[PDB]
Design an enzyme around this catalytic site. Structure first.
Site, PDB file in Angstrom:
ATOM      1  CG  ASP A   1       4.727  -2.266   8.423  1.00  0.00           C
ATOM      2  OD1 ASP A   1       4.978  -3.379   8.963  1.00  0.00           O
ATOM      3  OD2 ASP A   1       3.763  -1.542   8.766  1.00  0.00           O
TER       4      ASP A   1
ATOM      5  CB  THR B   1      -4.560  -2.339   4.296  1.00  0.00           C
ATOM      6  OG1 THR B   1      -3.361  -2.289   5.086  1.00  0.00           O
ATOM      7  CG2 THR B   1      -5.353  -1.059   4.511  1.00  0.00           C
TER       8      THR B   1
ATOM      9  CG  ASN C   1       3.406  -0.424   4.495  1.00  0.00           C
ATOM     10  OD1 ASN C   1       3.402   0.371   5.441  1.00  0.00           O
ATOM     11  ND2 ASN C   1       2.802  -1.600   4.544  1.00  0.00           N
TER      12      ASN C   1
ATOM     13  CE  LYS D   1      -0.556  -0.217   5.027  1.00  0.00           C
ATOM     14  NZ  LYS D   1      -1.560  -0.272   6.119  1.00  0.00           N
TER      15      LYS D   1
HETATM   16  N1  LIG Z   1       9.443   1.980   9.199  1.00  0.00           N
HETATM   17  C1  LIG Z   1       9.166   3.242   8.857  1.00  0.00           C
HETATM   18  N2  LIG Z   1       7.999   3.718   8.968  1.00  0.00           N
HETATM   19  C2  LIG Z   1      10.278   4.077   8.369  1.00  0.00           C
HETATM   20  C3  LIG Z   1      10.159   5.463   8.312  1.00  0.00           C
HETATM   21  C4  LIG Z   1      11.222   6.201   7.826  1.00  0.00           C
HETATM   22  N3  LIG Z   1      12.370   5.659   7.401  1.00  0.00           N
HETATM   23  C5  LIG Z   1      12.472   4.324   7.465  1.00  0.00           C
HETATM   24  C6  LIG Z   1      11.468   3.501   7.940  1.00  0.00           C
END
Ligand SMILES: N=C(N)c1ccncc1
Ligand SMILES: N=C(N)c1ccncc1
Length: 338
Positions: free
Chosen positions: A172, A189, A159, A156
């Protein structure tokens, strides 16, 4: 043969790390906390700075007691074991992991450009060349992951982070899983779920290719193909076998999407005898230089605006909560392998 030998080495290297995972490679007081970048029902992601090197990282913090209660134990062990074992240009790199009395920690590269979701909603929709550039990266990433027997299960726009060169970094892996054959967990989702997930079937990597159809539609239209106020109404549309396309979609785009959004998983592109090559050879990808994309030699559609590796302007604002570590160890048995 070049692709065969590439994927064979990719699997060899994955399996060596898979069978002997890294553990306990940093600790919390090696870092300064800067800002909360996102929050969920059992975890958070925080921008942190390593106190000795000065490097910035995104630190994912999972509350062990909440993971147990939300029945996410296996999924969180999946996520860490997979992330420490994979290596591909469009996957966010895990740098450290560790646990303490209360939490699990995954410290990964920080991608300052923010989520594709933000940029898509800012601009409205991407042009087909723009959507195609991102789609090609997901196709290659799924070719890599699926060859390792990994299903991703959470494609999505939220991510997919946009890096300093304008390329995608998938983050993620909370629902990713090593699967030979079928698996059965209801996860994902709602807007992106394949029909066979909704219908509680034993499903396989074909659900990732369905989700790619949803993602490409959403990138090119500005909204996903199956939208409704309640999940039940979304699910009815997904299983119906009916999708409407904006008139501005090219004929090639509509044809590719009909074959990715194929409700019969045995007829779905990516799941036929030619596998990923039915997608790579489709007319919608005729302009795509697959090797140049892999080598990051294509100029990106845009570079996110940010001031440096510590800039958080492309992420949004959350209440800042403590990282509390209990005096007593919680759920040690459940997370021994982490
Ligand atoms: N896992 C995340 N949301 C993430 C955010 C920013 N940079 C890397 C990972
Ligand atoms: N030059 C290109 N756009 C290209 C297209 C397809 N395959 C290779 C290169």
């Amino acid at each position: 043969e070049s692709v065969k030998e590439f994927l064979a080495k990719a699997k060899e290297e994955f399996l060596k790390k898979w069978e002997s995972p890294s553990q306990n490679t940093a600790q919390l007081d090696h870092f300064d906390r800067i800002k909360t970048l996102g929050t969920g029902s059992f975890g958070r992601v925080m921008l942190v700075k390593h106190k000795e090197t000065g490097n910035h990282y995104a630190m994912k913090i999972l509350d062990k007691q909440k993971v147990v209660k939300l029945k996410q134990i296996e999924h969180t062990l999946n996520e860490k074991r997979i992330l420490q074992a994979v290596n591909f240009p469009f996957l966010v790199k895990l740098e450290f992991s560790f646990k303490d009395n209360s939490n699990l920690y995954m410290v990964m590269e920080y991608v300052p450009g923010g989520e594709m979701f933000s940029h898509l909603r800012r601009i409205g929709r991407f042009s087909e060349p723009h959507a195609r550039f991102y789609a090609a990266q997901i196709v290659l990433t799924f070719e890599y992951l699926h060859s390792l027997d990994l299903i991703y299960r959470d494609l999505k726009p939220e991510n997919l982070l946009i890096d300093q060169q304008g390329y995608i970094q998938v983050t993620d892996f909370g629902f990713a899983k090593r699967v030979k054959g079928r698996t059965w967990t209801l996860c994902g989702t709602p807007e992106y779920l394949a029909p066979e997930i909704i219908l509680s079937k034993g499903y396989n990597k074909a659900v990732d290719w369905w989700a790619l159809g949803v993602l490409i539609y959403e990138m090119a239209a500005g909204y996903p193909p199956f939208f409704a106020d309640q999940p039940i109404q979304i699910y009815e549309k997904i299983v119906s076998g009916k999708v409407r396309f904006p008139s501005h979609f090219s004929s090639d785009l509509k044809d590719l999407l009909r074959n990715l959004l194929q409700v019969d998983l045995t007829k779905r592109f990516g799941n036929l005898k030619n596998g990923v090559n039915d997608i790579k050879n489709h007319k919608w990808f005729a302009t795509t230089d697959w090797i140049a994309i892999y080598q990051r030699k294509v100029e990106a559609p845009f570079i996110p605006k940010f001031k440096g590796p510590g800039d958080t302007s492309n992420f949004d604002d959350y209440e800042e909560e403590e990282i509390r570590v209990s005096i007593n160890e919680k759920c040690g048995k459940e997370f021994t392998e982490f």
